[PDB]
């Protein structure tokens, strides 16, 4: 069965995978997102599976509910942020890849995010390359990026349903 190296959070109903280089503040981003009222599925590694044409991501036991942040150590998220701050599984909707500005590819349309696609167990998951600047309120930026994505996906779902004619 299938593992995947990333953090997995529920943000605005969207299961969001977060990826990037080591020691850029990913785990710190998870914490900040939890503090804004979002939810943790898993830190570091995720179990993946297909059930009913859904890519579901789940955290293995033992590690469930815990986050590591250097300086702090282990964080029992449920103890500190409530039982509703953690979820045992959720569908994967989006994959965000945090990239250093210098390594960021050229932008075709700067009025939109840099969208790509990730193949996760043969399923197309939308993927955004997001430039990471230190101290521009990254949690708010990622939350805003995800909410925009959900509106955009609902935009396509409306358009498809609009073809009832």
């Amino acid at each position: 069965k299938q593992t995947w190296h990333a953090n997995f959070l529920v943000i605005d109903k969207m299961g969001v995978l977060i990826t990037g280089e080591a020691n850029i503040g990913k785990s710190e981003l998870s914490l900040a997102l939890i503090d804004r009222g979002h939810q943790l599925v898993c830190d570091d590694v995720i179990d993946l599976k297909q059930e009913n044409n859904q890519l579901i991501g789940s955290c293995p036991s033992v590690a469930n509910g815990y986050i590591l942040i250097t300086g702090i150590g282990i964080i029992d998220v449920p103890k500190l942020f409530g039982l509703d701050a953690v979820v045992n599984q959720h569908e994967v909707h989006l994959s965000i890849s945090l990239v250093k500005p210098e390594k960021m590819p050229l932008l075709d349309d700067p009025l939109n995010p840099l969208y790509r696609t990730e193949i996760i167990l043969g399923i197309n998951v939308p993927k955004i390359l997001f430039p990471i600047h230190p101290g521009r309120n990254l949690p708010l930026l990622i939350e805003t990026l995800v909410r925009n994505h959900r509106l955009k996906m609902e935009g396509y779902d409306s358009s498809h349903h609009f073809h009832e004619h």
Copy 2:
């Protein structure tokens, strides 16, 4: 008629103009300030005019309500933060100029901000030079700077009115 290159926000009843070099997180600052409960007038460019001894700043249509943040793209602020998160016009009270610490002039009195004056269509608008350090919670700092300014202006208005003797 008169344009002006800056961001224009309403903060604690004060119309505040934000200026600075390119790619330092100005638009990201606007978003963060909106998230703290403040209001957007306009991103990038502002229409200015004089009405009843007031310098009023207004956003041109089409662009009204939208913010661009690299990585995210366009942000329909009303859709995401509510109708009350945007305002069509407001009086200009303060101009903050975000400066890199290295380029910051010498400080005469470090117990107060570095105050200057901007001539905007012949009107004296108070101007603060604010040093920008990455990740010291700039939104909170700018909010605090503006609230202090309003108290200070109310201090002079009290003093002037105190000369009833």
Copy 3:
């Protein structure tokens, strides 16, 4: 009588001393912590004394209630954040020393903070060396570090009381 160079805040019932090199955002950290609902005892310097087997820290008058942040100047914290945002004294429970990542010593157990002890007027105060990265939401990190510490101290107090057998 005894002074001590540090910032002193009440965080989650814990009197916390904050220390570090000059111009790293300590005073900015105090402000941010106040904004999260915590309390100021004193900026810069603290009066210390022993009363009833407690190390109590108190702010000298005149300076009481005020914070200096370069760019802003003086901040009357009570005026801006309420009377309950400042406290005249509190017991010292923890000492956090903000360290630059490069100067940070080797980590024995990365699942826990780097704990040391400070002798303050002959009393053992637990001391954490915390690595400071710009823009990972340091206020949230320090708040989380302190809440974890309180749980940990309550853990030892439970264990000691558990030796009733």
